[PDB]
Amino acid sequence: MLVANINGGFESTPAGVVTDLAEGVEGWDLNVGSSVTNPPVFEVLETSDAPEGNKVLAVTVNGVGNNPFNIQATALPVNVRPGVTYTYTIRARAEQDGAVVSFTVGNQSLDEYGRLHHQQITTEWQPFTFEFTVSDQETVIRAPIHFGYAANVGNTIYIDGLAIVDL
Ligand SMILES: O[C@@H]1[C@@H](O)[C@H](O[C@@H]2CO[C@@H](O[C@@H]3CO[C@@H](O[C@@H]4CO[C@@H](O[C@@H]5CO[C@@H](O)[C@H](O)[C@H]5O)[C@H](O)[C@H]4O)[C@H](O)[C@H]3O)[C@H](O)[C@H]2O)OC[C@H]1O
Numbered sequence: 676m677l678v679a680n681i682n683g684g685f686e687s688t689p690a691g692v693v694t695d696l697a698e699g700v701e702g703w704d705l706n707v708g709s710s711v712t713n714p715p716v717f718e719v720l721e722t723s724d725a726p727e728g729n730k731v732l733a734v735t736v737n738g739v740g741n742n743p744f745n746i747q748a749t750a751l752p753v754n755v756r757p758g759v760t761y762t763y764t765i766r767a768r769a770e771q772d773g774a775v776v777s778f779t780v781g782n783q784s785l786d787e788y789g790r791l792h793h794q795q796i797t798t799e800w801q802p803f804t805f806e807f808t809v810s811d812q813e814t815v816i817r818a819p820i821h822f823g824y825a826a827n828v829g830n831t832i833y834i835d836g837l838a839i840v841d842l
């Protein structure tokens with residue numbers, strides 16, 4: 676496969692809680708805003724249930740901030756070509772009913788090219804997919820996943836298998 680993103684399945688990363696948010700996971704930047712007073716737990720988990728490889732990323736939300744992007748996992752770098760249309764696919768599930776996640780892609784200037792907005796995450800693995808086009812002249816973009824929805828308090832959201840593919 677030819678994918679734009681790096682370590683889309685977390686297989687590069689040792690199992691355990693991630694405390695180095697910026698650099699602890701190859702190909703990703705994790706972020707927690709200061710309005711989140713009970714910070715989430717990001718953990719790379721080795722599990723027989725992983726849809727891809729042996730590992731998944733678990734995001735335990737024990738509270739939230741002011742905006743859903745106050746808890747986020749962003750794939751970076753994402754290597755693309757101007758004008759090209761990509762398919763984004765990822766797998767996600769949650770520990771408990773009722774989770775909400777937005778899957779987004781944008782540039783380093785924070786302009787958003789597209790998203791899946793307030794996706795309904797269930798307790799079973801499901802794929803979430805959309806297309807976007809690089810509408811400007813960027814070659815290195817990013818893919819922010821937003822987890823800080825109030826409905827996720829008391830839940831863990833599991834993601835795996837991010838693939839951003841030409842089309
Ligand atoms: O440390 C820094 C981080 O804080 C930083 O985080 C990034 C901040 O910028 C974020 O991008 C903004 C996200 O919000 C976008 O506006 C959205 C767009 O979507 C709107 O919802 C639409 C509703 O209707 C639907 O049909 C449609 O599908 C939806 O899109 C929603 O209402 C708006 O809030 C802004 O345009 C973005 O700029 C980015 O995600 C974060 O990663 O990152 C850098 C780091 O240094």
Ligand SMILES: [Ca+2]
Nearest residue numbers: 684727728730
């Ligand atoms: Ca995996």
Ligand SMILES: [Ca+2]
Nearest residue numbers: 697698703704
């Ligand atoms: Ca990083």
